[PDB]
Coordinates of all heavy atoms in Angstrom, one line a residue:
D10 N -6.0 -3.7 -21.5 CA -5.3 -4.9 -21.8 C -4.9 -5.7 -20.5 O -5.6 -6.6 -20.1 CB -4.0 -4.7 -22.6 CG -4.2 -5.0 -24.1 OD1 -5.3 -5.4 -24.4 OD2 -3.2 -4.8 -24.8
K11 N -3.8 -5.3 -19.9 CA -3.0 -4.2 -20.4 C -1.6 -4.5 -20.5 O -0.8 -4.4 -19.6 CB -3.2 -3.0 -19.4 CG -2.3 -1.8 -19.9 CD -3.1 -0.8 -20.7 CE -2.3 0.3 -21.3 NZ -2.0 0.0 -22.7
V12 N -1.2 -4.8 -21.7 CA 0.2 -5.1 -22.1 C 0.9 -3.7 -22.0 O 1.4 -3.2 -23.0 CB 0.4 -5.6 -23.5 CG1 0.3 -4.5 -24.5 CG2 1.7 -6.3 -23.6
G13 N 0.9 -3.1 -20.8 CA 1.6 -1.9 -20.7 C 2.9 -1.9 -21.4 O 3.4 -1.0 -22.0
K14 N 3.5 -3.1 -21.2 CA 4.8 -3.3 -21.8 C 5.5 -1.9 -22.0 O 5.9 -1.6 -23.0 CB 4.8 -4.0 -23.1 CG 6.2 -4.2 -23.7 CD 6.9 -5.4 -23.0 CE 7.9 -6.1 -24.0 NZ 8.8 -7.1 -23.3
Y15 N 5.5 -1.1 -20.9 CA 6.3 0.1 -21.0 C 7.6 -0.4 -21.6 O 8.2 -1.4 -21.2 CB 6.5 0.7 -19.6 CG 5.3 1.5 -19.2 CD1 4.2 0.9 -18.7 CD2 5.3 2.9 -19.3 CE1 3.1 1.7 -18.4 CE2 4.3 3.7 -19.0 CZ 3.1 3.0 -18.5 OH 2.0 3.8 -18.2
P16 N 8.2 0.4 -22.5 CA 9.5 0.1 -23.0 C 10.5 0.0 -21.9 O 10.4 0.7 -20.8 CB 9.9 1.3 -23.9 CG 8.5 1.8 -24.3 CD 7.6 1.6 -23.2
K17 N 11.5 -0.9 -22.1 CA 12.5 -1.2 -21.1 C 13.2 0.0 -20.5 O 13.7 0.0 -19.4 CB 13.5 -2.2 -21.7 CG 13.0 -3.6 -22.1 CD 13.7 -4.4 -23.2 CE 14.0 -3.7 -24.5 NZ 12.9 -2.7 -24.9
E18 N 13.3 1.1 -21.3 CA 13.9 2.3 -20.8 C 13.2 2.9 -19.6 O 13.7 3.2 -18.6 CB 14.0 3.4 -21.9 CG 12.9 3.5 -22.9 CD 12.5 4.9 -23.3 OE1 13.3 5.8 -23.1 OE2 11.3 5.1 -23.8
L19 N 11.8 3.1 -19.8 CA 10.9 3.6 -18.8 C 10.7 2.7 -17.6 O 10.5 3.2 -16.5 CB 9.6 3.9 -19.5 CG 9.7 5.0 -20.6 CD1 8.3 5.2 -21.2 CD2 10.4 6.2 -20.1
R20 N 10.9 1.4 -17.8 CA 10.9 0.4 -16.7 C 12.0 0.7 -15.8 O 11.8 0.6 -14.5 CB 10.9 -1.0 -17.1 CG 9.8 -1.3 -18.1 CD 9.3 -2.8 -18.0 NE 9.3 -3.4 -19.3 CZ 10.3 -4.2 -19.8 NH1 11.4 -4.4 -19.0 NH2 10.2 -4.8 -20.9
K21 N 13.1 1.0 -16.3 CA 14.2 1.4 -15.5 C 14.0 2.8 -14.9 O 14.5 3.1 -13.7 CB 15.5 1.4 -16.3 CG 16.7 0.9 -15.5 CD 16.5 -0.6 -15.3 CE 17.7 -1.3 -14.6 NZ 19.0 -1.3 -15.4
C22 N 13.3 3.7 -15.5 CA 13.1 5.0 -14.9 C 12.3 4.8 -13.6 O 12.5 5.4 -12.6 CB 12.5 6.0 -15.8 SG 13.6 6.4 -17.3
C23 N 11.3 3.9 -13.7 CA 10.4 3.6 -12.6 C 11.1 3.0 -11.5 O 11.0 3.4 -10.3 CB 9.2 2.7 -13.1 SG 8.1 2.2 -11.8
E24 N 11.8 1.9 -11.8 CA 12.7 1.3 -10.9 C 13.6 2.2 -10.1 O 13.8 2.1 -8.9 CB 13.5 0.2 -11.6 CG 13.8 -0.9 -10.6 CD 14.5 -2.1 -11.2 OE1 14.7 -2.1 -12.5 OE2 14.9 -3.0 -10.4
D25 N 14.3 3.1 -10.8 CA 15.1 4.1 -10.1 C 14.3 5.0 -9.1 O 14.7 5.4 -8.1 CB 15.9 5.0 -11.0 CG 16.9 4.1 -11.9 OD1 17.3 3.0 -11.4 OD2 17.3 4.6 -13.0
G26 N 13.0 5.3 -9.5 CA 12.1 6.1 -8.7 C 11.8 5.3 -7.4 O 11.5 6.0 -6.4
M27 N 11.9 4.0 -7.4 CA 11.6 3.2 -6.3 C 12.7 2.8 -5.4 O 12.4 2.1 -4.4 CB 10.8 2.0 -6.7 CG 9.6 2.6 -7.5 SD 8.1 1.6 -7.4 CE 8.7 0.2 -8.4
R28 N 13.9 3.3 -5.6 CA 15.0 3.0 -4.7 C 14.8 3.6 -3.2 O 14.0 4.6 -3.0 CB 16.3 3.7 -5.1 CG 16.8 3.3 -6.5 CD 16.6 1.9 -6.8 NE 17.1 1.4 -8.1 CZ 18.4 1.2 -8.3 NH1 19.3 1.3 -7.3 NH2 18.8 0.8 -9.5
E29 N 15.4 3.0 -2.3 CA 15.4 3.4 -0.9 C 15.9 4.8 -0.9 O 16.7 5.1 -1.8 CB 16.2 2.4 -0.1 CG 15.6 1.1 0.2 CD 14.4 1.2 1.2 OE1 14.2 2.3 1.7 OE2 13.7 0.2 1.4
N30 N 15.5 5.6 0.0 CA 15.9 7.1 0.0 C 16.3 7.5 1.3 O 15.7 8.3 2.0 CB 14.6 7.9 -0.4 CG 14.8 9.4 -0.6 OD1 15.8 9.9 -0.9 ND2 13.7 10.1 -0.3
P31 N 17.5 7.0 1.7 CA 18.0 7.3 3.1 C 18.4 8.8 3.3 O 18.4 9.4 4.4 CB 19.3 6.5 3.2 CG 19.2 5.5 2.1 CD 18.5 6.1 1.0
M32 N 18.8 9.5 2.2 CA 19.0 10.9 2.3 C 17.7 11.7 2.4 O 17.8 12.9 2.5 CB 19.9 11.3 1.2 CG 21.3 10.8 1.3 SD 22.2 11.4 2.8 CE 23.4 10.1 3.0
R33 N 16.6 11.1 2.2 CA 15.3 11.8 2.3 C 15.2 12.9 1.3 O 14.7 14.0 1.6 CB 15.0 12.3 3.7 CG 14.9 11.2 4.8 CD 13.5 10.6 4.9 NE 12.4 11.7 4.9 CZ 11.1 11.5 5.3 NH1 10.7 10.3 5.6 NH2 10.3 12.5 5.3
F34 N 15.7 12.7 0.0 CA 15.5 13.7 -1.0 C 14.1 13.5 -1.6 O 13.6 12.4 -1.7 CB 16.5 13.6 -2.2 CG 17.9 13.9 -1.7 CD1 18.9 13.0 -2.1 CD2 18.2 14.9 -0.9 CE1 20.2 13.3 -1.8 CE2 19.5 15.2 -0.5 CZ 20.5 14.4 -1.0
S35 N 13.5 14.6 -2.0 CA 12.1 14.6 -2.5 C 12.2 13.9 -3.9 O 13.2 14.0 -4.6 CB 11.5 16.0 -2.5 OG 11.9 16.7 -3.7
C36 N 11.1 13.3 -4.3 CA 11.0 12.8 -5.7 C 11.4 13.9 -6.7 O 12.2 13.7 -7.6 CB 9.6 12.3 -5.9 SG 9.3 10.8 -5.0

Protein backbone atom coordinates (compact mmCIF):
# COMPACT_ATOMS: atom_id res chain seq x y z
CA ASP A 1 0.00 0.00 0.00
CA LYS A 2 0.97 0.93 2.39
CA VAL A 3 -1.68 2.39 4.65
CA GLY A 4 0.24 0.90 7.50
CA LYS A 5 -1.98 3.09 9.57
CA TYR A 6 -0.57 1.34 12.55
CA PRO A 7 -3.24 1.92 15.21
CA LYS A 8 -2.60 5.05 17.25
CA GLU A 9 -1.62 2.91 20.26
CA LEU A 10 1.33 1.35 18.44
CA ARG A 11 2.35 4.71 16.94
CA LYS A 12 2.89 5.87 20.42
CA CYS A 13 4.89 2.71 21.32
CA CYS A 14 7.21 3.52 18.35
CA GLU A 15 7.50 7.10 19.32
CA ASP A 16 8.50 6.21 22.86
CA GLY A 17 11.16 3.84 21.33
CA MET A 18 12.57 6.89 19.61
CA ARG A 19 13.16 9.18 22.61
CA GLU A 20 16.63 10.50 23.31
CA ASN A 21 18.48 8.06 25.63
CA PRO A 22 20.89 10.05 27.84
CA MET A 23 21.05 7.29 30.42
CA ARG A 24 22.17 4.93 27.62
CA PHE A 25 19.72 2.12 28.56
CA SER A 26 19.49 -0.57 25.99
CA CYS A 27 16.31 -0.93 23.94
